[PDB]
Amino acid sequence: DMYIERAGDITWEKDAEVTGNSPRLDVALDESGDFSLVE
Amino acid sequence: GETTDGVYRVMTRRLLGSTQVGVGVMQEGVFHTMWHVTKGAALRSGEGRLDPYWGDVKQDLVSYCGPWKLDAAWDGLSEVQLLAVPPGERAKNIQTLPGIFKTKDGDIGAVALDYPAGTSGSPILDKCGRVIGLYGNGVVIKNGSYVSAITQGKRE
Ligand SMILES: Cn1cc(NC(=O)c2cccc3ncccc23)cn1
């Protein structure tokens, strides 16, 4: 029986690390909920 | 058990030691995770049990104790944060501006922040600390890095 443990308040941080890009990917989705790229 | 709002770790002992299989969001007495993290199974909190209420393998979403409660949406412009919860590590905000999943049915926000699959279910937030979706369903790109949809459910 899988169990959960608490981890924090749901908060935006002022002065948090700003990384990560913004790509435009062409995507599909299968009936089993798996995304795939469409070139 | 614990019904306080916030982010939780989803753990199992059905392997070596205690293993974090994913993450979730407790809000308005409903636990929200990704389907691939629990496969629809019941959860323990304290000696209390959480039973699945709603799920969809195609959305890859599942709610416990009540219907899906999170209705906020990426505005299409503003930066967001992956309030990530990696396995063995403290909760950590990682800020970014979302890119785009383009599909026949419509366009979806995405994030290119790679992390252990055990972070699956970590909540993505807007500037007001509203959950606009969950991290951990997307695609491996040419690079070899992972890009995740901002997966959000529908509130009835
Ligand atoms: C069955 N299934 C599994 C997933 N998601 C993943 O495995 C996954 C989630 C988050 C980050 C990742 N990074 C690298 C590689 C995978 C991941 C979605 N569906």
Curated annotation (Swiss-Prot), chain B:
It is a peripheral membrane protein. The active site is at H36 (charge relay system), D60 (charge relay system), S120 (charge relay system). It comes from the Viruses. Acetylated by host KAT5. Acetylation modulates NS3 RNA-binding and unwinding activities and plays an important positive role for viral replication. It is found in: Host cytoplasm; Host endoplasmic reticulum membrane. Residues 1-156 form the Peptidase S7 domain. Displays three enzymatic activities: serine protease, NTPase and RNA helicase. NS3 serine protease, in association with NS2B, performs its autocleavage and cleaves the polyprotein at dibasic sites in the cytoplasm: C-prM, NS2A-NS2B, NS2B-NS3, NS3-NS4A, NS4A-2K and NS4B-NS5. NS3 RNA helicase binds RNA and unwinds dsRNA in the 3' to 5' direction. Leads to translation arrest when expressed ex vivo. Disrupts host centrosome organization in a CEP63-dependent manner to degrade host TBK1 and inhibits innate immune response. Inhibits the integrated stress response (ISR) in the infected cell. Forms a heterodimer with NS2B. Interacts with NS4B. Interacts with unphosphorylated RNA-directed RNA polymerase NS5; this interaction stimulates RNA-directed RNA polymerase NS5 guanylyltransferase activity. Interacts with non-structural protein 2A. Interacts with host SHFL; this interaction promotes NS3 degradation via a lysosome-dependent pathway. Interacts with host CEP63; this interaction disorganizes the centrosome and inhibits host innate immune response. This is Serine protease NS3. It comes from Zika virus (ZIKV).
